[PDB]
């Protein structure tokens, strides 16, 4: 059932400390697996998912080395972008990168990710088909025709079918007991000091495993939902979430109004 690859990496130019902050976060589901930060006293990758401890420390070095070493490119690419985009060096800048192997239900992959963004908007990105690129503008477009010749797609293609998934499958199996969980919404409603006479009443989730839930109100007959509050599913921050969605009601006009909570992690 169809299943997470990503490395969300960023190096962000410090102006007055001086050297740029780099973080490298691995996501197996929705889930962490590892993070690393140049800033932490001693920079290494640390296991995020506890099952990750059941990983040899050859994996640690073998990998933190790829970080010490990766760190080292971001810097050089930050300055190289400074030129095209004509910026100073006394200012802040952010190169972000995203990649992964688009999992699959049974074992095979379906999608290749390889996108870069410089200073908030997309810079350079690898297409679906893994061979071809898409640049945003002329300077970003210079990275394009060069990379092009040399063979960057090939080198990534290699890796997106390869090392990638082998590994995904690893964490996937050395994962699973922990990736399955889940948390039932612990719900309710609240009447409030509101309106005119128009009580505001709210359906609070408040903290459920894993992010996905939607909750609706019933007149008695209909799902209002053509009508307004809810809230962005927020963390907690123990590792659960909370959502609240609501309506207006006459004063004492209780008459009818219901709500349905949907969280499969839950048979409502």
């Amino acid at each position: 059932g169809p299943h997470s690859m990503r490395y969300f990496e960023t190096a962000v130019s410090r102006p007055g400390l001086g050297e740029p902050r780099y973080i490298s976060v691995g996501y197996v589901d929705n889930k962490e697996f590892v993070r690393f930060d140049s800033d932490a006293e001693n920079p290494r990758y640390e296991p995020q998912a506890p099952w990750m401890e059941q990983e040899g420390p050859e994996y640690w070095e073998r990998i933190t080395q790829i970080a010490k070493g990766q760190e080292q490119w971001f810097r050089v690419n930050l300055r190289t972008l400074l030129g095209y985009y004509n910026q100073s060096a006394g200012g802040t800048h952010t190169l972000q990168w995203m990649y992964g192997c688009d999992v699959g239900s049974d074992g095979r992959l379906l999608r290749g990710y390889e996108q870069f963004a410089y200073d908030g908007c997309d810079y350079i990105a690898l297409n679906e088909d893994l061979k071809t690129w898409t640049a945003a503008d002329m300077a970003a477009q210079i990275t394009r025709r060069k990379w092009e010749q040399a063979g960057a797609a090939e080198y990534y293609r290699a890796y997106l079918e390869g090392e990638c998934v082998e590994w995904l499958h690893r964490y996937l199996k050395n994962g699973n007991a922990t990736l399955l969980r889940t948390d039932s919404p612990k719900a309710h409603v609240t009447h409030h000091p509101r309106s005119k006479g128009e009580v505001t009443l709210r359906c609070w989730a408040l903290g459920f495993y894993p992010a996905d839930i939607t909750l609706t109100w019933q007149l008695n007959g209909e799902e209002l939902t053509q009508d307004m509050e809810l809230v962005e599913t927020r963390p907690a921050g123990d590792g659960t979430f909370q959502k609240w969605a609501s309506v207006v009601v006459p004063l004492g006009k209780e008459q009818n109004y219901t709500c349905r909570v949907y969280h499969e992690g839950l048979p409502e």
């Binding site: 990496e9 490298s24 691995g26 990275t143 990379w147 040399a150 080198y155």
Partner: peptide, 9 residues
């Protein structure tokens, strides 16, 4: 497992 970057901007 991340992957070496190996070509400049």
């Amino acid at each position: 497992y991340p992957n070496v970057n190996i070509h400049n901007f």
